[PDB]
Structure formats: C-alpha cells, structure tokens
Design a protein around this ligand. Sequence first.
Ligand SMILES: Nc1ncnc2c1ncn2[C@@H]1O[C@H](COP(=O)(O)OP(=O)(O)O)[C@@H](O)[C@H]1O
Ligand SMILES: [Mg+2]
Lengths: 49, 457, 206, 577
Amino acid sequence: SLQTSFVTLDEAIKITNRRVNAIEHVIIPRIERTLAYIITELDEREREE
Amino acid sequence: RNYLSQPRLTYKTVSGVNGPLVILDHVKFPRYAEIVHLTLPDGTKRSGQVLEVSGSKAVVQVFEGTSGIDAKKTSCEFTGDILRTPVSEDMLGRVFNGSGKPIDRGPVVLAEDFLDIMGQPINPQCRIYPEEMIQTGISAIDGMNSIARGQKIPIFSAAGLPHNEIAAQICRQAGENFAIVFAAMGVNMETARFFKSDFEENGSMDNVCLFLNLANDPTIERIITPRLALTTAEFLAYQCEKHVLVILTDMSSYAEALREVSAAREEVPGRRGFPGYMYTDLATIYERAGRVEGRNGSITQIPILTMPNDDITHPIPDLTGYITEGQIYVDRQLHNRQIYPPINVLPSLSRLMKSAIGEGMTRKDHADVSNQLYACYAIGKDVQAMKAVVGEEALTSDDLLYLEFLQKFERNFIAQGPYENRTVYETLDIGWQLLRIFPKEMLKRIPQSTLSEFYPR
Amino acid sequence: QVWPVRQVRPVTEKLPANHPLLTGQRVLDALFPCVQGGTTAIPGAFGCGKTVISQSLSKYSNSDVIIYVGCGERGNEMSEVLRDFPELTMEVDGKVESIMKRTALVANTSNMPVAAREASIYTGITLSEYFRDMGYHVSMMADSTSRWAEALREISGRLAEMPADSGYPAYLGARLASFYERAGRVKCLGNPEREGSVSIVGAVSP
Amino acid sequence: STFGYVHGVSGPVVTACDMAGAAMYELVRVGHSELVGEIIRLEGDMATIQVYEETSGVSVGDPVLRTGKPLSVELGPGIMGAIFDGIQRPLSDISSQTQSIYIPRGVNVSALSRDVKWDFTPCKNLRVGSHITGGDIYGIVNENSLIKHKIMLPPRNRGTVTYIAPPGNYDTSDVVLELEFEGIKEKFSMVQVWPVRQVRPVTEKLPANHPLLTGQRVLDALFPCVQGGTTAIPGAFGCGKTVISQSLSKYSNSDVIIYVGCGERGNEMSEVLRDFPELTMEVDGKVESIMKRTALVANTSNMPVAAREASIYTGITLSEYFRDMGYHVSMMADSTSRWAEALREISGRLAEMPADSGYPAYLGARLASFYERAGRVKCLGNPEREGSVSIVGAVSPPGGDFSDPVTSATLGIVQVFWGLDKKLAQRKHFPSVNWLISYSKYMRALDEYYDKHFTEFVPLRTKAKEILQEEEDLAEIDKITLEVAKLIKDDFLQQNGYTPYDRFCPFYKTVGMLSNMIAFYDMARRAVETTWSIIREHMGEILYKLSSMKFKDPVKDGEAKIKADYAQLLEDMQNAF
Ligand SMILES: Nc1ncnc2c1ncn2[C@@H]1O[C@H](COP(=O)(O)OP(=O)(O)O)[C@@H](O)[C@H]1O
Ligand SMILES: [Mg+2]
C-alpha cells in the first residue's frame, strides 16, 4: 500500500516541479520584460508630447 | 600662395545668451561654420563654432561653456574660415587635450597642412574593398569574427566590463608600418592614465597619437574630439600611406555630448531623447575608414561604446549596428565567471568574414568551421534554456553533448589571458579539437568534401 | 531627354500582373512569391541580411535590367557591388556577358549629405520608369527607405514642422505612397505596342 | 550700472531690466528683502533671473543689486564645526542672531563669522619682497587643537610680498597680505571666495595607493577602498547607513570629514544634527569631539531647490579646499538620488527635454564631473604637500532596484560598491554589507601597499573569496568548506559596533584573523585528503580559540599578535593526530 504510494508521488512531483519551473523561468520573465517595454514606450510618447 | 589676408573684425555686440548659445548682432556677412574667438571680460579665451545665421544675427555656440559671458564687455572676435586643425606627421607621440592643445608640456604643432575637420566623403567608385585580414590574436576576434584591414567594427560593452582592457590588447598585438590614433571621450582619470601608461610600456609611443578628453573637460569639446582624431588619421593614411588604427573610447559618451547640445538647440528628438540626425552624425565619424585605390595606406576603426542597461535595442548600439560593418559583443555573464576576453560569439558578427578567408588568404576550412561553431553554440545555448525547466536528467544523449561542448567552449576557445596572442592556425587547431568531442553527421553546416580531412587527427 | 523626377511618367493603361519574379531563393519563391510589377518590403534589424537578399536579386533575377538604389547605405557595400559584378556572366541567347551591362547604380552613401537622400530615391525610380518605356522588365532595389524617411525628419526639423508619431512629419504616408505606386506592369505609350514592368523591392531598416 | 530694476516677476523667474553689465550665472539680490537670485538668460539689456526664495511680494521696480560673483563659497577660518545649507549660510549662527525658528527668507548673514578672532602666524622665511605664486601656504591659523588651518594664496593671483602681517590676532576682514604685481598693489584678507562649479586648480594628479582603513573587518580586508577613491552605497531605511556614515568619520585615517546631507528629510536630518555634535574621537591624548574636524552641509526638502542642487557642489568645494593644505579629506554625500530629483526640478522649470526617465540630458555628465573631483593629488604651492579627497555617495533607488537612470549612471563611475542589504539587517548580521554583489575595482592598485607593508595578505583574500564563492552553490545543494565559511561569516565578517574593542580593529588584527582561518582551512584540506567527523569533535577547543580571537582589547597590542602566534601553533599539533 506504500510501494504503490511511493511511485505515484514521483509522477506527481515531477509534473508539478516543471510547472513551478515553467512559471519561474518562462512565463514570469516573459511578463517582466514585457512590462519593462510598456514603461519605456510610455516614456517615448511622454517626451513626444 | 593661396590664403586670406583681410584683418578680422572684433564685435562687442552680443545680444542673447540662453544656454550654450551666444546670439550676436550687427554681424556683417557671417558664414555658416566659422570659428569665433570669444574674449571674456576677465581675460579668458573661449572658442566656438557658428551654429546658424539669419540676416544680421549669428548664433554661435561656445565650446568651453558660457558661464561668465557678459552682454557689454565681452568681445567676440571672428575668423573668416572653417575649423582647420593643425595636422602634421610630428603629431605622433604627443598627448593632446580635448580641442587641440598639447598636454605633456610640449609645443604647438608646426603643421605642414591645415585640414578641414569635417572632411570630405570618399568617392565610392574609387573606394576599394577591404580584403587584407589583420591578426589580433584573440581567438574570439581573430578566428571566429575575423576583421580586415580597413573594416569599421565596434566593441559592444557595458559599465564595469573590461572593454578598455582588451581594446589596449588589440592595440598592442595587431598585425613596422602600423600607426595608432587614440581618442578618449569621457574617460575617467584612471582610464586616461591606464591608456597613457600602457603605450609607455611596449615602446609603441613612437606611433601613438593619444587624444585625451577627461570627464572634467567641457561637453561640447567631445563633439570635435573624434573629428580631429580622424582627420589626423586621414593624414597619416590617404596622404602619407601608412596603416592607421583608430580607437574611439566611449562612443556612448560622445552621444550624450550630442544629446545634450541638441536639447539646448530645442530640435526634433528621436528615440530616447537623442536627436533626429543622430544616425548621420554617427556616420560622418564612422564612414572615414577603408582603403582607396591610389594609396597604399589604410584606416581601420575599433570604436568602443557602453550600451546603457545592457540593452542592444538602446539607440547607441542600435544606430552603430546599422552603419558599421559588424559588431563585437562583450558579455557580462562570462565576465562573472572570470573568462578573460569576456566575449560571447552569438550577437557578435563580422561582415567582412566572407572575404578575408579562403585558400588564398587563410586555410579554407576556417570560413566553413565558423558556420558550424555557431550552430553548436546556438543549439547548445537553448539546451541550458531547456535545462532550467525540466531537469538535468531528462536530457537525451544528443543534448548532453551540446552542454558538453558549451562548457568546454568558453574556457578553451576563449580566455587567452591578457598577454598571450595566438595565430589563426593556433585558433583552428584549438578550435577543431572542440568539434572532435562531437560525433560525425551532426556537423550539418560542413560539407563532406572538407569534413573528410580535418576530422581524423 | 530631360524629365522631372517628381512627376510620374505618363503611360497608356495599367495591366494586372501575372508572371512571377524568380528571385532564386527557396523560401521566397515558394511561400511568399513576388510578381514582376509588384511592390515588396524587406524589414529586419541590423545583421539580419537585408542586403544579401537585395544583392541576390540584382544577380540572379529574371529581369531585363536592374537598378540598385543605395539610399543612406554603406560606402563599402556599393564598392562590393561594382567589384564582383563584372566577373558574374549570365546567358540570354547562348552568349555570356557580365551583369554590369544591365545594372545601373544610384549610389548615395550615409557620408553624402542628407537632403540628397530625397533625390536618390526619385532619380532611381525615374531611370526605372524610363527603361520601362522601352518594354524591359525593370526591377528596382531601394536600399533603404528607412534612411529616406530619416531625411524627411531632419529636413522638417529645420522648418519647425509639427511632427507625427516618433518625430517623422505627417506626410510620411504620402511620400511612400507616391513612390511605391509608381511600380506595376503596364502597356507603355507609343505605337510599337510593348509591355514593360517595374518591380520595387524596398528594404526597410526599423 | 550699479542697480537693476525688476520689470516683471512670473513665478520663480524675474526678468530684470537695466542690467547691461550682467554676466551669466551671477548672483543678485532681488527686492528690498534681498532675495538671492541667479541670472540664467541674457536678452540684451534685460536679464532673466530665477530666484531661489519664494518671490511673494516682489513689485515691478524693486532694486536688483548685482554682485559680480558666481555661485561661490567663502573659504577660511571658522568653517570647522559649522552647519551650512546648500548656499553656505550658517544655520547655527542664523538661530542665535535672529532668535527665531524659521529662516527669515532675506538674511544675508556672512558665512564666516566676522567677530571671532584667530591667532595668525606667518610662514617664517616668507619675507617682504619674496615672490609668491598661487597655492603657496602663506600662514597657519590654529582653528582647533586638531586642525591647523593653513592660510593659502588664491590660485588666480600672483606677485611679490609688500605688506605682511605680524604674528598676532586678526579678524576675517583685516588685511593680512598685500601683493605687488605689474599693475596694482592688490590686498586680500584671510577669506577667499571660490565658485563651486569651477574645479580647484592643482599641479598633477597621482594614482591613489593608501587604503582607507574605515575600521570594519569586512570593509578594510575584502572590499577595500583607497583614499582618493569613489564609493557608492545603497540607501534603504535600515541596512547600515548610520554605521558607515559615522564609523568612517570616527575611526578612519582621514584628517577631516565633510558630510553633505543633500535634501534628506525633516527628522532624518534632525537626528544627524543630534548625533554628530556629540560623537567622540580617540586621539593620542584624551578624547575630543568629532566637531573639531567635521563640517556639515545640512539641507531639508523644505529648502529651495537651487540650494539642493548646489549642496553637492558646496560640499565638494569645502572638501577640495582642505585637500590643498595637505590633509586627507573624505566626503560623505548622502544622498545623490535626492540630488538627482533636484536636477529634475531645475531643468523642469526651464522646460528642457527630459532625456531618460524624466531626468535631464546632463545627468550622466554632472555626476561624472563631480566624482572626478576626487583623487590623491600633489597640491599647488612651493611647500610641495600632497592631499586627497574621498567621495562616498549614497544611492537611494526607488524600490531598491539597480536599474535606474541615476543608479546605473553612478555604478559606472564609482569603483567600490559596499552593497548593504536589508535582509542581512533583518537577521541582525551587522554590518549588513553583502558579499556577492559588492566589489572593488581597487584591488590591482593596492597590492603594492600589500607587498611593501603587510606581505601575507593577498594570498588570503584571493582564496577566502573563493571560499565564499564556493559556499553559495554548495548551500544550494566540501563539507570542510561549509564549516569554515560559517566561521568567517560569524566571527570575521560579523562585527558588533558596541563592544569596547570590536567597534574598531586595526589592520594587523584583520590580517591576523584571516591568516588563522585560512591556515586552519588548508591544513584541514590536507587532513581529509589522507576524517571530518572526528575533526569536528576532537578539535572543539581550537575552534573555540578561533571563534574567540575577536576580543583582543586595545590594552593588548603586542599581545594581540603574540596570542595569534600561540593559537597558530596549536593548530599545527592536532592536524597530525
Ligand atoms: N543567405 C545568405 N548567404 C550568405 N550570407 C548571409 C546570408 N544571409 C545573411 N548572411 C550574412 O549575414 C550578414 C548580414 O549582412 P548585412 O546584409 O550587411 O546585414 P544587414 O541586413 O543589416 O545590412 C552578413 O555577414 C552576411 O554574409
Ligand atoms: Mg543593409
């Protein structure tokens, strides 16, 4: 009852630690370096006016 | 023979001073870019170009700043010609200040010719194309991004990175007929002393024309500093036929001295405050390069620019990326790992790589192995991007070698050390070893006619 | 004959475009084909190869004449052209001769002054419109029109014009439209009844 | 002309007419209340003047009295211990002369007191008729027991001595010297006036070599700074900013300390004027106050914004004047980010183009023209003395991010960056300087001092930095290295500033403690390369000899070295066992 509980956790911890590392290294640094682009594009119109 | 002998007028009729611009009045026939000689009421001598005229007015701009200029007592003293630098072959071994004057207690130059600092554009019909490959010794510059004698190519760096430490290196070991003109715009006291005391070592001071302009010097003098550095080098080459190497420190810091003077003129801001003509005024000081037909001389530019906030989309690496003939990128992640020339080879391309390599020039496998050493680099760089997400064990046997090459590529093909030069034959024989930790048939950029010789060794 | 470069050449009646422009590239001829009598734009950043497609067009196209316009280009890139062209011989009727017989260069580098960048675009399309009237299937490589639009900005900055978005004047869409629309295959004027073409490939440097 | 009339005020700006002999950036006196203004445009006969004060109640026709001098300071005796604003008005004297609590908005009180008399002595072989050039030491004034305020010549003028003063007591308005030149016998007192935007002239700059022993163990050893160097620190609320500002004034090898509070706060400026008047320094005799070698440029955000821009330039001109006497000045700029928000107001009033995130076009050029005024440099003058100026500039970024148009511009000019962390200050790791982000570009220039003196130091630092570099990757996931790096972070790098010895250590102990913690390390590297658990259990007493080395009191000077010998040989025994 624990041998079939042991290996089913390592199939659910690996497909969870990827989704941690997909958010941490792909989704957030795509949003973060997008948000740094909206700031400068606001600024290049604030000096144009 | 041909000269002007009319005495110069001396106006005491300034009318408007707003920022660095001194608007004169009752001027009689002012030309467009005359140098005027301001005489301050406390005996200070300042100089300045004429920015624009209109009727009787003449809006000059002062080089040394405008602080102290009166309205009644100051005597602006005109000169009926354009800015002519005093240029000679004996400007070779002397340290000059920003505008034109010597630093190391020397005399003013005797100057067998007077040249226009704006120059003239070279006829593209009689402008021959650079083919003679120069040797730098740094394997990232010599082997992978080979530069030819006459090519303009910058060094892309940031603050803190050792751009000035490896630019003196290619100034040291480039290859009896090689001259060097150096321009330092906006350097520190240390960097101006680090460059002064580096050419005091190798005995290269007999062919060095150091133009220092420190950070305390006025900001309009940084405009005419790379102008005089090139028309000096357009006299040591193109009129005396010797191979000059121009190095412009801080071409970034030239452009903040171009942004500041244009905001004082209140005209047409482009991207990020830089003016609208910032492509042109970085092109009139970059396109003075290359070889011509009827001269044995040459002039090759290695400018240095610090891109702000590591962004290659900033207008300072952007507009020089369009007008030069390549770029050399210095990486900050490789500097943090104590890699010596901390250069990364992926955004650093040399446009004249296709001509300077061949069976006539250098070792026919060199032009083709650099197509493959980008491919093993570019695929392996995505592998470390993949290794951050899934795990170090989910990689297959193909993309474990792409990490195995990439770890061995940085420390063996690069990081020569600050006093070791290695030739192109030593570069390829240490560069073919990195492709021999790869198996066959994955080197897809290499044809089979050339792969058959160099792989068994 | 003397013809003003800002005035479009008169012509009989425009025709639809049916024959493709064989550029020789695999991705270009297959997925995104261009016809002779068409307008094309090649954007992209620095170091991407916007001119090595333009130099591949001037070497291996199925066009009668070629006119290459260097507008704010490099000085070495026009010297690159006139060197390697007289050894590239191509065939038409079993006879080989270099491509410099069919190539006319309008060279206006970045060192050369900024108001002349307006003229080098309008000159190179006027020679392209004149060779169209002979019946030849003219091509034209504008290189690059983003340095032409920077000449409109620098001129309008002195005239105290009010700018549009990002510095450029408000008539930027009317100068590009009055230059790109001068292309198209068209039955020419005159009695011998010949059909020419003008195909504009204009590089853009954003 | 002598006076000018107002002819219109439209805010801070005053377009004063009838000023034909007015130069740029001169200081004027607008109105009957004599508000200080700055000439900023010059349209023929009129001159557009921006006024520093509130221009409320200025009528058309008030006299504008021009001075003929730019924005300048008064350099002379009576400057030590005084508290100035950005435009050099004495805040201590302005409270006793007026007996109020507000600044009276129009008082032109002299910057140096014209009533306190000083004991002047001549230069003693500076005879009458002897030729004297600019920068020569002309006399000596005993300002305090600490500072010998050497009277110098101004760098502009020159000539031969005609009238000199006998040794006695003099005022700041008494004529001390009279010089014969070709034209005029020119006379001048003990007070010289120097503009702040103009660099003090000097003979020749030298490379900086002598390190600033600020007192802490982590700063003087791992990330050193040299006198004549530049330094940036972060500017959060609590990391270490009160420590590094006051330990460098108390225990460093600097002859004077000039602190520039550049538009800080209301009560954060009040705590500096509550603490600096009662700090004490241990000279070789009995203890004395720190206010005999300290000068304060105090400035709140309520004050005029042209006295917030010029507070940096005033504080560096006082720092460059004391450099020329031969002293080793150090200047603490706190902060520079509140100075960059003062340039945005000055250029924002002139409607100039905002270049990078609001800040004007010359933000990178005004910072680089201020950090370049530091450096060890042989001064002007025939006595041939050398001085230095060290500039420490606090950077206060929004949110603590190091990507900012003034933070990235400052870290491209400075060489030492003592990165102070809030997270290290939360865990009470004092001092809270980080070791990953912090650096020094001042390591290559200091090995000459670390070879002529202190020879066994540079193999230790180049090794112990790799120990802290290896430890961060090991803590992410060798067992000898994790223990000894814990000992360095808890004994060597950590430092309690309230212990009667550990508030300040010299360098011989600092090179002493890192010698033993490295000699214990490579021996334990050998002792495993022949068992680690027995090492942690059997050597528990010598680990107590290491972790208690920090308590070598300054009654123990040679014994502190002697105890370092005997705790070294005890490690030689147990490594073989
Ligand atoms: N199809 C191609 N064949 C050969 N080389 C190419 C090709 N495409 C791009 N390159 C290379 O990419 C670089 C781009 O050259 P270039 O056209 O001058 O950049 P840009 O488009 O900015 O002007 C050159 O080194 C060129 O040799
Ligand atoms: Mg191109």
